[model samples]
Target: MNELDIQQEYPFTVESMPVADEIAGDETVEIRLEIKPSGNFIGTVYTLRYFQPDGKGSLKMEDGTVLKPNDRYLLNEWKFRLYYTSQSDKEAQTIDLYFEDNWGNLQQLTYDFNGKLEHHHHHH
Candidate 1:
């Protein structure tokens, strides 16, 4: 339900954001991140899971590994680029994440990406 009672700490810290400040619908955004695993997480199995709660979209890693509903991977290499292909017409997109360590310490994280409206109508 929560973190590991013994070593109650985050397994990793994420450093990420979309390449641009704003995005439009159907425009795939390239996001970069680093797992930044600490001593507590080194050589340990990692499982990071998340979903876009605010907007509709699909997320995948640079290696084209799709982030499924309930799956995970051990991050021996901590940094990679993610492809976020948005499909919703929302002002912002939110990424709600849950990650953990081998000891079962779960950490929660959230990220928001601003959206830019597509000006396709007649500009009078």
Candidate 2:
């Protein structure tokens, strides 16, 4: 789809775990989004998985590619994947995710935090 068709007005934002803990060694990011439609909100939700790191500092969507800027990718809705590994095994983080893109594509920004993506939609 063309960039013009993207829902730029959605003004979405994502926040995850790895948040600072009062004790220590309990940081994790949670996934969430805010859909402010007009002067109000159409819906709001929280996801258990914000994003998943594919062993490397990279991640992949349904198409199996690291997410990054300068991409014309599309997502069905807002969903996130969560991962974590033991200190002894850096490459072995638990993997889990939830959240669905509008197009049901299941995608992400491919950035450090919640990955932002743009796609088209028919406003009914």
Candidate 3:
């Protein structure tokens, strides 16, 4: 299909997992994406093909893949994890994601690690 045609016919909506406000060290965080069709496009199969910034040094997914339901449209959810490793103090973290649609097309998305570690101060 042409670019314009594909744009008009894009059938699915993707809602990625919400990034945490503060991710701590050595913590396992759940990362998932939910996809639902917009119109009568129930037969289309959506795939969480791969992810970018694949969690860098502080973030990693279990088994390095996104697992989800097999029925495609019936139970639409992509499941994954974010393994956080403490790093030098930084303001924010970012990750990119790529998903594949049934029609052999790729879509790009970005996720910002907006979580902050709880810092406790002790006055001795």
Candidate 4:
């Protein structure tokens, strides 16, 4: 068994957590972020994703069709070249998370490499 390490390597910064107004299955949500101490950022250049944690403290991307791992991302500097996806009208069913970086780049948290949505259920 391993302990849950909230403090990942790249130092994840929670930019925003916006709930989706329209989504199916699990009522998906979006998590956004701004490059904190990860590395050099000319502009904010944000990212988003529709995912769920695997209880091991990892995020999983949901494509409304299947659950996929964000292979492009490196959570908390734990790796490198994290998968940062740009938000577009293509995914209309998305949560908008606005952010600006030092270099003056407009970023949004949509269905990309954002974050996961976890639900709290009462267990009796």
**lDDT for each residue of candidate 4 in 75-122, tens digit (9 for 90 to 100):** 232122222233232323332333334343445454432234444456
Compared with the true structure, all predictions reach lDDT values of: 0.70, 0.35, 0.49, 0.35
lDDT of 1 by residue, 60-86 (tens): 878888787455665656677878788
The TM-score ranking, best first, is 1, 3, 2, 4
Q: Estimate each model's TM-score.
A: 0.66, 0.24, 0.46, 0.21
**Judged by TM-score relative to the true structure, which candidate is superior, 3 or 4?**
3
lDDT comparison, 2 vs 3, better candidate: 3
| Best-matching candidate per TM-score | 1
Give candidate 1's TM-score: 0.66
Write the number of the candidate with greater lDDT, choosing between 1 and 4.
Answer: 1
Residue 63, candidate 2: C-alpha displacement in angstroms:
7.2
> Per-residue lDDT of 18-49 in model 2, one digit per residue for the tens?
42222112233332333332323334332223
Q: Point out the worst 10-residue segment of candidate 3 by lDDT.
A: 67-76
* Candidate that would win on lDDT: 1
Looking at model 2, residue 20 earns an lDDT score of: 21
